[PDB]
Ligand binder design. Sequence first.
Ligand SMILES: *NC(=O)c1ccc[n+]([C@@H]2O[C@H](COP(=O)([O-])OP(=O)(O)OC[C@H]3O[C@@H](n4cnc5c(N)ncnc54)[C@H](O)[C@@H]3O)[C@@H](O)[C@H]2O)c1
Ligand SMILES: *c1cc[n+]([C@@H]2O[C@H](COP(=O)([O-])OP(=O)(O)OC[C@H]3O[C@@H](n4cnc5c(N)ncnc54)[C@H](O)[C@@H]3O)[C@@H](O)[C@H]2O)cc1C(N)=O
Ligand SMILES: [Mg+2]
Ligand SMILES: [Mg+2]
Lengths: 359, 360
Amino acid sequence: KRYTITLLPGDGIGPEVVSIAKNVLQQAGSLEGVEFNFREMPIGGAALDLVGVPLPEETISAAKESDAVLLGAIGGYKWDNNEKHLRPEKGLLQIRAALKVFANLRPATVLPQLVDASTLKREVAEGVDLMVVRELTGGIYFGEPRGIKTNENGEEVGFNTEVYAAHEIDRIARVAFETARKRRGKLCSVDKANVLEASILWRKRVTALASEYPDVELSHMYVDNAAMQLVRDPKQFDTIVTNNIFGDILSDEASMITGSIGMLPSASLSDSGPGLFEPIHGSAPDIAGQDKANPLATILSAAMLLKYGLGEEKAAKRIEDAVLVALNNGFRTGDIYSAGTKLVGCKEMGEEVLKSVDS
Amino acid sequence: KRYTITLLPGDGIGPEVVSIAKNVLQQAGSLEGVEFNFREMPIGGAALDLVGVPLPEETISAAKESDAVLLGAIGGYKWDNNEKHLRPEKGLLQIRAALKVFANLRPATVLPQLVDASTLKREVAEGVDLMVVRELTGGIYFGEPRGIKTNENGEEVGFNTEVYAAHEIDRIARVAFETARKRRGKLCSVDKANVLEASILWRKRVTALASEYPDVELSHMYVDNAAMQLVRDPKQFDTIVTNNIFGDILSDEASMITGSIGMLPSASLSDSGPGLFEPIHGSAPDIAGQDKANPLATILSAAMLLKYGLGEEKAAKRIEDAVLVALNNGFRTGDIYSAGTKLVGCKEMGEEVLKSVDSQ
Ligand SMILES: *NC(=O)c1ccc[n+]([C@@H]2O[C@H](COP(=O)([O-])OP(=O)(O)OC[C@H]3O[C@@H](n4cnc5c(N)ncnc54)[C@H](O)[C@@H]3O)[C@@H](O)[C@H]2O)c1
Ligand SMILES: *c1cc[n+]([C@@H]2O[C@H](COP(=O)([O-])OP(=O)(O)OC[C@H]3O[C@@H](n4cnc5c(N)ncnc54)[C@H](O)[C@@H]3O)[C@@H](O)[C@H]2O)cc1C(N)=O
Ligand SMILES: [Mg+2]
Ligand SMILES: [Mg+2]
């Protein structure tokens, strides 16, 4: 049983972390009887240096033909000064649209081993287990009209439009509901409907679907409160559904509960289409090549790649299990270092994670 | 002296916290030879229930002609179902634009007594200090075009426009830099310039003014890292400048560092015009009339009114000191209750601040 996997290493620590996950992927899948066809294609800063655009057509077709796509990270200091159309991050947004992967899943759950690693008091952060369902292919990140023009004044004005059509909200809502059922049956839609006509529609469509999902209990919370709640009593959430710009911010805030931004993986899914799996981190421009980075998040994106994109649930559990063994043995990278643990770097963790897969 | 203060008690817990602050404002100013003309006006749900709109024209004029504006909060379940034009929250937005208070100062600094009140560990949260300078009157909260239309396929499509003109960015960056130089000399601009052309201009303009303030050490951070940073190592920030919507989010997150959202005051300032002072929290529909509320944010929001809006610094320090006295005496409301303290509600906590103002 063979699968075609496209690796998009990217920039920063992207290559570093993906190489590790690729090996974890081959070994874990091999134990459950699957081999893989790996194929590196350029994206972001890498593609810019090679072909001159952040996302070449050659990459998009290569990703579509594949069964699933594993991305590292994107962006870097060298290209921070390009035109808006030639920054690397523009490649990531395009690949999300190109793959039509609207439903973005970021699960932040605190492992018992990393409780001392969080910055939250133990009682606050122990046992947290929430899942963020973020709208990925629409909204202010993809909203038209946008740009910077110069009106008659001679003043520059920058503008983007946060815009969602109803069907865009509906599809992400069901995924929230379906997911919130698979968990603890509680769902929380986060918007800013006290001000934004976009958030008015957002809540309006989400309240609609609750009748179709009575197994799921829906509640609504404003985005400013939710950021505070994720620090006051983060244990409260089961599933949170929200839009692109709030999904990005809140999920990035939630990481520091589990111990670091380097612990969180993300699965980006579509109907039919092959899924896009990446870590929410990216892309450590300041510890690039120093071999300091935490690769766990990228490994788990390979876990999620198997679980959600290819359905090899058994293999994915082996991946989770290895990360658990590795942490039980005391191995921490810099960001998840606790007193009395063992501070490894990146290769030197991936190896002895792979020790656990292989045992 | 004799200043005119407009009290906008809003909704929810608004009335009680402002009432308590009104007494503290009165006494603290009174000790320094200062009197006040208090004029109460309807805003938000109160005004909807009275005249049928969130912000009556009579309220705006009364607010304009006063020296300082003291607001509680806005919003409540009763009015959550009105047409968009008729939402209490829109009155808040309207009074800010009407008063042209673009510079929003929300300072989150962790007090020694409330370290245990935080959910961040002591080492992380002890000595935290930061000030958020938020663009208040521009941005997505005020951007046109906006509305809910229907495209030809009959689908309802909602939209807002995040838009900043160059001068909108410039003046608030100036406030940020000016704030830093009185502070610890660090400024951190937060945007999403990897995706948003609005923020690209925000970055372009803010870096530009950096040449005018060599005294201030300016750094740039994307908003998603910013959220993780306020939890990873919040001791780092000195002054943070950002736009309307990112300011809302980040300032609420930063609140929990100091113990609860009920600790944070906010001053909103304008050129020449009288400023609008509110606590950053909402109307707390869940604790309203139970006398559970934390008044400190509003008592401290009254402190900012004296210091920043009226220049009565000595009286303003009287309010600040009293909050400290009450906290040294063990008094906590529910949101800032840490073990072995004395749990009180809103009305006595307020009396215990007053108890202490009148002791010096
Ligand atoms: N969706 C993406 O792939 C993505 C999201 C956001 C930004 N980028 C691009 O990366 C660089 C830099 O962005 P930052 O503002 O620096 O945010 P991060 O790069 O993730 O840095 C956060 C801090 O945490 C550290 N960190 C990240 N990942 C880590 C791991 N695995 N181990 C240890 N430490 C990690 C970082 O060093 C930071 O200190 C920009 O160009 C942006 O466009 C891509
Ligand atoms: C800015 C934004 C929104 N509002 C309006 O206020 C209404 C309340 O909704 P919300 O629950 O989402 O925000 P809120 O701050 O009210 O709630 C915060 C949570 O924390 C508790 N809490 C708040 N404030 C206090 C205080 N002062 N003391 C103790 N506990 C507090 C609350 O129980 C709650 O759980 C909503 O309609 C929204 O429209 C208002 C503002 C503004 N400045 O007016
Ligand atoms: Mg991010
Ligand atoms: Mg707020």
